[PDB]
RNA sequence: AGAGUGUAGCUUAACACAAAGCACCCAACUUACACUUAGGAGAUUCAAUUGACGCUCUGA
């Protein structure tokens, strides 16, 4: 059950806006990373 | 400020102190070098030791009078 | 005491595709996004998104959107890999890519003397080898391909004894990350079977109890 | 400048979701912990029974069964992914 | 009092005493790693598994990835089976799962309360 | 096919004046745990001491 743990909000009091940026670098693999 | 021989300040400079380092001072009292180690601000935890409680008393006095309570906290010194 | 020398290997292939979202999950995804954005100090993107746009508006009265555009539309035509490679075959149980959102077990057809039934791969245990060693032996004998199945700790997961003389079978797990099959059309009848049809796969009552040590997840 | 989003207040409509959907989380997570614990119980009982059965059959084989595996020293494993490489 | 049958009813310190795996959970996202670390720790607490520390060493210089570690102990070889299976299944997004060991080369700063009895037994 | 049993995970807790007391779950403080705070889901298996629905063990 990857789905429940995957989407989480960080418990830091102050952080910049996180957009789910796609991470591909000639690896053929899609990863959604907040940047 | 603290008046002390600038010679005694050299061994503290001789330590390549980095932030988050754990410092042991086997002979602390009366102080001077210990105060300098505290002034560095790179030491996470301080260990101060001396055999004679007479001398450690004046060590306690000087670190109390010079160093605020905020920095002492819990087992940082 | 008379015993039939049997052993079993559970080849639980891990999911390759992430589990689908229940309605509540995407509902809360949008929600947590809202909470996330509502508590922030400043972000470098908002400087170009709003601030420079505002002063540009002031300049005009007397673009971040543009650079966001090309980002968006470039990967639209550059189509990524298929999330679901399940539905295209729909029937290829022999294929590794049959179901990738759930744990699957490799299952072979055994041909016994007096009963003909689909059972989990067998292992003929020897007193020379250890119980664990039996599982490793049957990698090449039954699958005849490339194996990189990871073997965890030695422990009996389950035990079943059936009498016609008697039989004894012990179950051990293994993790097979990649199961590329050299001979797709091998004589051996091997299929990758999900948990939900695993019950319908085998007929016996006694070996239906297997479900206890194999998790659906 | 150190102020992104000052005001985020809204009508009771938002709070209705904020509350009830969080209660739905409590329910949803309740079911999943129950089934997690179900697997726990099922697993430990299964291995226990199996080991007992091996023990009574052969006293020497269960001894070699309960060794810790040296292959779990460099144990490295991944899990699920978005799309296959 | 010694001779009275109530003796040693005040005894308390006999009830107390006055006298290993590492799990790596690296992810690029900083909103993900600690969440799963939390989850694993919660599983450990429930099944009576001893935990040492959740240490974090700094982000690699640039692009930037950070490592979250959980120390665990008291795990049996038999119980490992169940435990490791769950922590493998619960893997969120391509997180490197490691099991590292203290190799007798990986000392602690003792507290003042702990030191006095240590000194008493030393001499 | 027989042999036993039955309260949400546990407890004979239950005279009532009630179906109780620990376990459990998200939320904020926390690297975390934990404590505390603010919330949620819970049962006396079904029909009149008896009979049959669920579980368990022996029946090839």
PDB file of N, CA, C and O in Angstrom, chain C residues 33-99:
ATOM      1  N   UNK C  33      -2.873  19.502  -0.431  1.00  0.00           N
ATOM      2  CA  UNK C  33      -2.285  20.491  -1.320  1.00  0.00           C
ATOM      3  C   UNK C  33      -2.699  21.888  -0.860  1.00  0.00           C
ATOM      4  O   UNK C  33      -1.859  22.783  -0.782  1.00  0.00           O
ATOM      5  N   UNK C  34      -3.995  22.044  -0.548  1.00  0.00           N
ATOM      6  CA  UNK C  34      -4.580  23.306  -0.123  1.00  0.00           C
ATOM      7  C   UNK C  34      -3.993  23.745   1.217  1.00  0.00           C
ATOM      8  O   UNK C  34      -3.661  24.916   1.382  1.00  0.00           O
ATOM      9  N   UNK C  35      -3.858  22.795   2.156  1.00  0.00           N
ATOM     10  CA  UNK C  35      -3.289  23.044   3.474  1.00  0.00           C
ATOM     11  C   UNK C  35      -1.813  23.420   3.326  1.00  0.00           C
ATOM     12  O   UNK C  35      -1.344  24.351   3.984  1.00  0.00           O
ATOM     13  N   UNK C  36      -1.108  22.705   2.438  1.00  0.00           N
ATOM     14  CA  UNK C  36       0.313  22.896   2.187  1.00  0.00           C
ATOM     15  C   UNK C  36       0.582  24.335   1.744  1.00  0.00           C
ATOM     16  O   UNK C  36       1.432  25.010   2.323  1.00  0.00           O
ATOM     17  N   UNK C  37      -0.182  24.793   0.741  1.00  0.00           N
ATOM     18  CA  UNK C  37       0.039  26.077   0.086  1.00  0.00           C
ATOM     19  C   UNK C  37      -0.395  27.231   0.992  1.00  0.00           C
ATOM     20  O   UNK C  37       0.125  28.338   0.857  1.00  0.00           O
ATOM     21  N   UNK C  38      -1.329  26.958   1.916  1.00  0.00           N
ATOM     22  CA  UNK C  38      -1.918  27.994   2.755  1.00  0.00           C
ATOM     23  C   UNK C  38      -0.990  28.349   3.918  1.00  0.00           C
ATOM     24  O   UNK C  38      -1.144  29.412   4.520  1.00  0.00           O
ATOM     25  N   UNK C  39      -0.037  27.458   4.225  1.00  0.00           N
ATOM     26  CA  UNK C  39       0.988  27.744   5.218  1.00  0.00           C
ATOM     27  C   UNK C  39       2.372  27.697   4.568  1.00  0.00           C
ATOM     28  O   UNK C  39       2.944  26.627   4.361  1.00  0.00           O
ATOM     29  N   UNK C  40       2.873  28.893   4.229  1.00  0.00           N
ATOM     30  CA  UNK C  40       4.168  29.108   3.599  1.00  0.00           C
ATOM     31  C   UNK C  40       4.654  30.524   3.903  1.00  0.00           C
ATOM     32  O   UNK C  40       3.862  31.379   4.301  1.00  0.00           O
ATOM     33  N   UNK C  41       5.960  30.759   3.708  1.00  0.00           N
ATOM     34  CA  UNK C  41       6.576  32.047   4.002  1.00  0.00           C
ATOM     35  C   UNK C  41       6.800  32.848   2.717  1.00  0.00           C
ATOM     36  O   UNK C  41       6.297  33.965   2.599  1.00  0.00           O
ATOM     37  N   UNK C  42       7.564  32.267   1.779  1.00  0.00           N
ATOM     38  CA  UNK C  42       7.771  32.776   0.430  1.00  0.00           C
ATOM     39  C   UNK C  42       8.466  31.709  -0.413  1.00  0.00           C
ATOM     40  O   UNK C  42       9.261  30.922   0.104  1.00  0.00           O
ATOM     41  N   UNK C  43       8.147  31.701  -1.712  1.00  0.00           N
ATOM     42  CA  UNK C  43       8.757  30.801  -2.677  1.00  0.00           C
ATOM     43  C   UNK C  43       9.206  31.588  -3.905  1.00  0.00           C
ATOM     44  O   UNK C  43       8.507  32.496  -4.354  1.00  0.00           O
ATOM     45  N   UNK C  44      10.368  31.198  -4.445  1.00  0.00           N
ATOM     46  CA  UNK C  44      11.048  31.887  -5.534  1.00  0.00           C
ATOM     47  C   UNK C  44      10.165  31.957  -6.779  1.00  0.00           C
ATOM     48  O   UNK C  44      10.307  32.878  -7.582  1.00  0.00           O
ATOM     49  N   UNK C  45       9.253  30.985  -6.920  1.00  0.00           N
ATOM     50  CA  UNK C  45       8.346  30.912  -8.054  1.00  0.00           C
ATOM     51  C   UNK C  45       7.283  32.007  -7.975  1.00  0.00           C
ATOM     52  O   UNK C  45       6.922  32.579  -9.001  1.00  0.00           O
ATOM     53  N   UNK C  46       6.808  32.302  -6.756  1.00  0.00           N
ATOM     54  CA  UNK C  46       5.775  33.302  -6.519  1.00  0.00           C
ATOM     55  C   UNK C  46       6.305  34.712  -6.783  1.00  0.00           C
ATOM     56  O   UNK C  46       5.521  35.618  -7.063  1.00  0.00           O
ATOM     57  N   UNK C  47       7.632  34.880  -6.685  1.00  0.00           N
ATOM     58  CA  UNK C  47       8.303  36.137  -6.983  1.00  0.00           C
ATOM     59  C   UNK C  47       8.134  36.479  -8.463  1.00  0.00           C
ATOM     60  O   UNK C  47       7.885  37.633  -8.806  1.00  0.00           O
ATOM     61  N   UNK C  48       8.259  35.460  -9.325  1.00  0.00           N
ATOM     62  CA  UNK C  48       8.121  35.640 -10.763  1.00  0.00           C
ATOM     63  C   UNK C  48       6.660  35.492 -11.192  1.00  0.00           C
ATOM     64  O   UNK C  48       6.260  36.056 -12.207  1.00  0.00           O
ATOM     65  N   UNK C  49       5.868  34.752 -10.403  1.00  0.00           N
ATOM     66  CA  UNK C  49       4.483  34.457 -10.744  1.00  0.00           C
ATOM     67  C   UNK C  49       3.588  35.677 -10.531  1.00  0.00           C
ATOM     68  O   UNK C  49       2.663  35.898 -11.312  1.00  0.00           O
ATOM     69  N   UNK C  50       3.877  36.461  -9.483  1.00  0.00           N
ATOM     70  CA  UNK C  50       2.985  37.518  -9.030  1.00  0.00           C
ATOM     71  C   UNK C  50       3.670  38.884  -9.073  1.00  0.00           C
ATOM     72  O   UNK C  50       3.126  39.819  -9.663  1.00  0.00           O
ATOM     73  N   UNK C  51       4.852  38.983  -8.448  1.00  0.00           N
ATOM     74  CA  UNK C  51       5.487  40.259  -8.140  1.00  0.00           C
ATOM     75  C   UNK C  51       5.902  40.989  -9.416  1.00  0.00           C
ATOM     76  O   UNK C  51       5.559  42.158  -9.590  1.00  0.00           O
ATOM     77  N   UNK C  52       6.624  40.285 -10.302  1.00  0.00           N
ATOM     78  CA  UNK C  52       7.124  40.865 -11.542  1.00  0.00           C
ATOM     79  C   UNK C  52       5.975  41.121 -12.518  1.00  0.00           C
ATOM     80  O   UNK C  52       6.045  42.061 -13.307  1.00  0.00           O
ATOM     81  N   UNK C  53       4.924  40.288 -12.436  1.00  0.00           N
ATOM     82  CA  UNK C  53       3.693  40.454 -13.196  1.00  0.00           C
ATOM     83  C   UNK C  53       2.994  41.750 -12.789  1.00  0.00           C
ATOM     84  O   UNK C  53       2.445  42.449 -13.641  1.00  0.00           O
ATOM     85  N   UNK C  54       3.030  42.054 -11.483  1.00  0.00           N
ATOM     86  CA  UNK C  54       2.375  43.223 -10.915  1.00  0.00           C
ATOM     87  C   UNK C  54       3.098  44.505 -11.326  1.00  0.00           C
ATOM     88  O   UNK C  54       2.445  45.495 -11.653  1.00  0.00           O
ATOM     89  N   UNK C  55       4.439  44.477 -11.304  1.00  0.00           N
ATOM     90  CA  UNK C  55       5.232  45.642 -11.673  1.00  0.00           C
ATOM     91  C   UNK C  55       5.217  45.843 -13.190  1.00  0.00           C
ATOM     92  O   UNK C  55       5.307  46.978 -13.653  1.00  0.00           O
ATOM     93  N   UNK C  56       5.074  44.740 -13.941  1.00  0.00           N
ATOM     94  CA  UNK C  56       4.908  44.771 -15.388  1.00  0.00           C
ATOM     95  C   UNK C  56       3.572  45.427 -15.740  1.00  0.00           C
ATOM     96  O   UNK C  56       3.484  46.157 -16.727  1.00  0.00           O
ATOM     97  N   UNK C  57       2.548  45.155 -14.917  1.00  0.00           N
ATOM     98  CA  UNK C  57       1.225  45.748 -15.049  1.00  0.00           C
ATOM     99  C   UNK C  57       1.289  47.253 -14.789  1.00  0.00           C
ATOM    100  O   UNK C  57       0.592  48.022 -15.450  1.00  0.00           O
ATOM    101  N   UNK C  58       2.141  47.653 -13.833  1.00  0.00           N
ATOM    102  CA  UNK C  58       2.345  49.047 -13.464  1.00  0.00           C
ATOM    103  C   UNK C  58       3.106  49.785 -14.567  1.00  0.00           C
ATOM    104  O   UNK C  58       2.831  50.957 -14.821  1.00  0.00           O
ATOM    105  N   UNK C  59       4.055  49.084 -15.208  1.00  0.00           N
ATOM    106  CA  UNK C  59       4.849  49.612 -16.310  1.00  0.00           C
ATOM    107  C   UNK C  59       3.955  49.878 -17.522  1.00  0.00           C
ATOM    108  O   UNK C  59       4.117  50.894 -18.197  1.00  0.00           O
ATOM    109  N   UNK C  60       3.016  48.955 -17.773  1.00  0.00           N
ATOM    110  CA  UNK C  60       2.090  49.023 -18.895  1.00  0.00           C
ATOM    111  C   UNK C  60       1.062  50.136 -18.681  1.00  0.00           C
ATOM    112  O   UNK C  60       0.660  50.790 -19.642  1.00  0.00           O
ATOM    113  N   UNK C  61       0.655  50.339 -17.418  1.00  0.00           N
ATOM    114  CA  UNK C  61      -0.353  51.320 -17.039  1.00  0.00           C
ATOM    115  C   UNK C  61       0.164  52.745 -17.238  1.00  0.00           C
ATOM    116  O   UNK C  61      -0.607  53.636 -17.594  1.00  0.00           O
ATOM    117  N   UNK C  62       1.469  52.942 -16.996  1.00  0.00           N
ATOM    118  CA  UNK C  62       2.133  54.226 -17.160  1.00  0.00           C
ATOM    119  C   UNK C  62       2.277  54.538 -18.655  1.00  0.00           C
ATOM    120  O   UNK C  62       1.592  55.476 -19.109  1.00  0.00           O
ATOM    121  N   UNK C  63       7.819  36.631 -18.902  1.00  0.00           N
ATOM    122  CA  UNK C  63       6.581  36.239 -18.175  1.00  0.00           C
ATOM    123  C   UNK C  63       6.737  34.819 -17.637  1.00  0.00           C
ATOM    124  O   UNK C  63       7.226  33.934 -18.339  1.00  0.00           O
ATOM    125  N   UNK C  64       6.301  34.625 -16.384  1.00  0.00           N
ATOM    126  CA  UNK C  64       6.384  33.347 -15.690  1.00  0.00           C
ATOM    127  C   UNK C  64       5.403  32.342 -16.290  1.00  0.00           C
ATOM    128  O   UNK C  64       5.692  31.147 -16.330  1.00  0.00           O
ATOM    129  N   UNK C  65       4.248  32.847 -16.746  1.00  0.00           N
ATOM    130  CA  UNK C  65       3.199  32.048 -17.364  1.00  0.00           C
ATOM    131  C   UNK C  65       3.721  31.430 -18.660  1.00  0.00           C
ATOM    132  O   UNK C  65       3.411  30.278 -18.963  1.00  0.00           O
ATOM    133  N   UNK C  66       4.529  32.208 -19.395  1.00  0.00           N
ATOM    134  CA  UNK C  66       5.087  31.820 -20.683  1.00  0.00           C
ATOM    135  C   UNK C  66       6.070  30.660 -20.525  1.00  0.00           C
ATOM    136  O   UNK C  66       6.038  29.721 -21.319  1.00  0.00           O
ATOM    137  N   UNK C  67       6.931  30.729 -19.499  1.00  0.00           N
ATOM    138  CA  UNK C  67       7.929  29.694 -19.266  1.00  0.00           C
ATOM    139  C   UNK C  67       7.307  28.464 -18.602  1.00  0.00           C
ATOM    140  O   UNK C  67       7.874  27.375 -18.672  1.00  0.00           O
ATOM    141  N   UNK C  68       6.141  28.650 -17.966  1.00  0.00           N
ATOM    142  CA  UNK C  68       5.352  27.553 -17.419  1.00  0.00           C
ATOM    143  C   UNK C  68       4.663  26.799 -18.558  1.00  0.00           C
ATOM    144  O   UNK C  68       4.511  25.579 -18.481  1.00  0.00           O
ATOM    145  N   UNK C  69       4.265  27.539 -19.604  1.00  0.00           N
ATOM    146  CA  UNK C  69       3.561  26.997 -20.759  1.00  0.00           C
ATOM    147  C   UNK C  69       4.397  25.907 -21.426  1.00  0.00           C
ATOM    148  O   UNK C  69       3.968  24.757 -21.479  1.00  0.00           O
ATOM    149  N   UNK C  70       5.600  26.275 -21.895  1.00  0.00           N
ATOM    150  CA  UNK C  70       6.459  25.394 -22.677  1.00  0.00           C
ATOM    151  C   UNK C  70       6.841  24.141 -21.887  1.00  0.00           C
ATOM    152  O   UNK C  70       6.965  23.068 -22.476  1.00  0.00           O
ATOM    153  N   UNK C  71       6.999  24.288 -20.562  1.00  0.00           N
ATOM    154  CA  UNK C  71       7.208  23.180 -19.640  1.00  0.00           C
ATOM    155  C   UNK C  71       6.062  22.175 -19.748  1.00  0.00           C
ATOM    156  O   UNK C  71       6.298  20.969 -19.779  1.00  0.00           O
ATOM    157  N   UNK C  72       4.831  22.700 -19.814  1.00  0.00           N
ATOM    158  CA  UNK C  72       3.608  21.913 -19.761  1.00  0.00           C
ATOM    159  C   UNK C  72       3.419  21.131 -21.061  1.00  0.00           C
ATOM    160  O   UNK C  72       3.124  19.938 -21.016  1.00  0.00           O
ATOM    161  N   UNK C  73       3.598  21.806 -22.207  1.00  0.00           N
ATOM    162  CA  UNK C  73       3.184  21.254 -23.491  1.00  0.00           C
ATOM    163  C   UNK C  73       4.284  20.411 -24.143  1.00  0.00           C
ATOM    164  O   UNK C  73       4.007  19.708 -25.115  1.00  0.00           O
ATOM    165  N   UNK C  74       5.513  20.473 -23.609  1.00  0.00           N
ATOM    166  CA  UNK C  74       6.632  19.737 -24.186  1.00  0.00           C
ATOM    167  C   UNK C  74       6.489  18.238 -23.920  1.00  0.00           C
ATOM    168  O   UNK C  74       6.786  17.432 -24.799  1.00  0.00           O
ATOM    169  N   UNK C  75       6.020  17.885 -22.713  1.00  0.00           N
ATOM    170  CA  UNK C  75       5.946  16.499 -22.272  1.00  0.00           C
ATOM    171  C   UNK C  75       4.588  15.882 -22.617  1.00  0.00           C
ATOM    172  O   UNK C  75       4.379  14.692 -22.385  1.00  0.00           O
ATOM    173  N   UNK C  76       3.679  16.698 -23.173  1.00  0.00           N
ATOM    174  CA  UNK C  76       2.379  16.230 -23.636  1.00  0.00           C
ATOM    175  C   UNK C  76       2.558  15.354 -24.875  1.00  0.00           C
ATOM    176  O   UNK C  76       1.985  14.270 -24.953  1.00  0.00           O
ATOM    177  N   UNK C  77       3.360  15.844 -25.830  1.00  0.00           N
ATOM    178  CA  UNK C  77       3.657  15.129 -27.063  1.00  0.00           C
ATOM    179  C   UNK C  77       4.726  14.064 -26.810  1.00  0.00           C
ATOM    180  O   UNK C  77       4.729  13.028 -27.474  1.00  0.00           O
ATOM    181  N   UNK C  78       5.621  14.330 -25.847  1.00  0.00           N
ATOM    182  CA  UNK C  78       6.596  13.353 -25.382  1.00  0.00           C
ATOM    183  C   UNK C  78       5.925  12.414 -24.380  1.00  0.00           C
ATOM    184  O   UNK C  78       6.123  12.537 -23.171  1.00  0.00           O
ATOM    185  N   UNK C  79       5.142  11.467 -24.915  1.00  0.00           N
ATOM    186  CA  UNK C  79       4.323  10.556 -24.129  1.00  0.00           C
ATOM    187  C   UNK C  79       5.216   9.591 -23.352  1.00  0.00           C
ATOM    188  O   UNK C  79       6.102   8.955 -23.922  1.00  0.00           O
ATOM    189  N   UNK C  80       4.954   9.504 -22.041  1.00  0.00           N
ATOM    190  CA  UNK C  80       5.684   8.640 -21.125  1.00  0.00           C
ATOM    191  C   UNK C  80       5.197   7.198 -21.275  1.00  0.00           C
ATOM    192  O   UNK C  80       4.239   6.934 -22.001  1.00  0.00           O
ATOM    193  N   UNK C  81       5.876   6.279 -20.572  1.00  0.00           N
ATOM    194  CA  UNK C  81       5.529   4.867 -20.541  1.00  0.00           C
ATOM    195  C   UNK C  81       4.133   4.629 -19.969  1.00  0.00           C
ATOM    196  O   UNK C  81       3.663   5.394 -19.126  1.00  0.00           O
ATOM    197  N   UNK C  82       3.487   3.559 -20.448  1.00  0.00           N
ATOM    198  CA  UNK C  82       2.124   3.214 -20.074  1.00  0.00           C
ATOM    199  C   UNK C  82       2.079   2.764 -18.615  1.00  0.00           C
ATOM    200  O   UNK C  82       2.834   1.881 -18.209  1.00  0.00           O
ATOM    201  N   UNK C  83       1.188   3.405 -17.845  1.00  0.00           N
ATOM    202  CA  UNK C  83       0.956   3.101 -16.441  1.00  0.00           C
ATOM    203  C   UNK C  83       0.309   1.725 -16.305  1.00  0.00           C
ATOM    204  O   UNK C  83       0.612   0.990 -15.366  1.00  0.00           O
ATOM    205  N   UNK C  84      -0.585   1.396 -17.247  1.00  0.00           N
ATOM    206  CA  UNK C  84      -1.268   0.112 -17.273  1.00  0.00           C
ATOM    207  C   UNK C  84      -0.841  -0.641 -18.532  1.00  0.00           C
ATOM    208  O   UNK C  84      -1.224  -0.274 -19.644  1.00  0.00           O
ATOM    209  N   UNK C  85      -0.026  -1.685 -18.328  1.00  0.00           N
ATOM    210  CA  UNK C  85       0.364  -2.615 -19.378  1.00  0.00           C
ATOM    211  C   UNK C  85      -0.296  -3.968 -19.108  1.00  0.00           C
ATOM    212  O   UNK C  85       0.259  -5.018 -19.439  1.00  0.00           O
ATOM    213  N   UNK C  86      -1.501  -3.914 -18.524  1.00  0.00           N
ATOM    214  CA  UNK C  86      -2.244  -5.082 -18.078  1.00  0.00           C
ATOM    215  C   UNK C  86      -3.343  -5.415 -19.087  1.00  0.00           C
ATOM    216  O   UNK C  86      -3.543  -6.583 -19.419  1.00  0.00           O
ATOM    217  N   UNK C  87      -4.030  -4.371 -19.572  1.00  0.00           N
ATOM    218  CA  UNK C  87      -5.283  -4.496 -20.303  1.00  0.00           C
ATOM    219  C   UNK C  87      -5.056  -4.874 -21.767  1.00  0.00           C
ATOM    220  O   UNK C  87      -5.979  -5.367 -22.417  1.00  0.00           O
ATOM    221  N   UNK C  88      -3.835  -4.640 -22.271  1.00  0.00           N
ATOM    222  CA  UNK C  88      -3.506  -4.852 -23.676  1.00  0.00           C
ATOM    223  C   UNK C  88      -3.549  -6.338 -24.024  1.00  0.00           C
ATOM    224  O   UNK C  88      -4.029  -6.702 -25.097  1.00  0.00           O
ATOM    225  N   UNK C  89      -3.051  -7.185 -23.112  1.00  0.00           N
ATOM    226  CA  UNK C  89      -3.131  -8.629 -23.277  1.00  0.00           C
ATOM    227  C   UNK C  89      -4.447  -9.139 -22.688  1.00  0.00           C
ATOM    228  O   UNK C  89      -5.226  -9.779 -23.392  1.00  0.00           O
ATOM    229  N   UNK C  90      -4.672  -8.837 -21.397  1.00  0.00           N
ATOM    230  CA  UNK C  90      -5.872  -9.166 -20.637  1.00  0.00           C
ATOM    231  C   UNK C  90      -5.936 -10.664 -20.326  1.00  0.00           C
ATOM    232  O   UNK C  90      -6.623 -11.065 -19.386  1.00  0.00           O
ATOM    233  N   UNK C  91      -5.194 -11.480 -21.088  1.00  0.00           N
ATOM    234  CA  UNK C  91      -5.343 -12.926 -21.037  1.00  0.00           C
ATOM    235  C   UNK C  91      -4.002 -13.622 -20.798  1.00  0.00           C
ATOM    236  O   UNK C  91      -3.984 -14.786 -20.397  1.00  0.00           O
ATOM    237  N   UNK C  92      -2.893 -12.905 -21.039  1.00  0.00           N
ATOM    238  CA  UNK C  92      -1.561 -13.491 -20.981  1.00  0.00           C
ATOM    239  C   UNK C  92      -1.132 -13.671 -19.525  1.00  0.00           C
ATOM    240  O   UNK C  92      -0.396 -12.851 -18.976  1.00  0.00           O
ATOM    241  N   UNK C  93      -1.605 -14.774 -18.929  1.00  0.00           N
ATOM    242  CA  UNK C  93      -1.297 -15.174 -17.565  1.00  0.00           C
ATOM    243  C   UNK C  93       0.159 -15.631 -17.480  1.00  0.00           C
ATOM    244  O   UNK C  93       0.791 -15.495 -16.433  1.00  0.00           O
ATOM    245  N   UNK C  94       0.664 -16.170 -18.599  1.00  0.00           N
ATOM    246  CA  UNK C  94       2.044 -16.607 -18.758  1.00  0.00           C
ATOM    247  C   UNK C  94       2.981 -15.400 -18.696  1.00  0.00           C
ATOM    248  O   UNK C  94       4.102 -15.517 -18.205  1.00  0.00           O
ATOM    249  N   UNK C  95       2.507 -14.249 -19.194  1.00  0.00           N
ATOM    250  CA  UNK C  95       3.278 -13.015 -19.207  1.00  0.00           C
ATOM    251  C   UNK C  95       3.437 -12.468 -17.791  1.00  0.00           C
ATOM    252  O   UNK C  95       2.519 -12.555 -16.976  1.00  0.00           O
ATOM    253  N   UNK C  96       4.622 -11.900 -17.535  1.00  0.00           N
ATOM    254  CA  UNK C  96       5.015 -11.344 -16.249  1.00  0.00           C
ATOM    255  C   UNK C  96       4.223 -10.068 -15.957  1.00  0.00           C
ATOM    256  O   UNK C  96       3.978  -9.746 -14.794  1.00  0.00           O
ATOM    257  N   UNK C  97       3.806  -9.370 -17.023  1.00  0.00           N
ATOM    258  CA  UNK C  97       3.225  -8.039 -16.922  1.00  0.00           C
ATOM    259  C   UNK C  97       1.695  -8.102 -16.893  1.00  0.00           C
ATOM    260  O   UNK C  97       1.034  -7.118 -17.231  1.00  0.00           O
ATOM    261  N   UNK C  98       1.144  -9.244 -16.452  1.00  0.00           N
ATOM    262  CA  UNK C  98      -0.292  -9.490 -16.443  1.00  0.00           C
ATOM    263  C   UNK C  98      -0.993  -8.546 -15.466  1.00  0.00           C
ATOM    264  O   UNK C  98      -2.012  -7.952 -15.814  1.00  0.00           O
ATOM    265  N   UNK C  99      -0.450  -8.442 -14.245  1.00  0.00           N
ATOM    266  CA  UNK C  99      -0.971  -7.574 -13.199  1.00  0.00           C
ATOM    267  C   UNK C  99       0.205  -7.064 -12.370  1.00  0.00           C
ATOM    268  O   UNK C  99       0.969  -7.859 -11.827  1.00  0.00           O
TER     269      UNK C  99
END
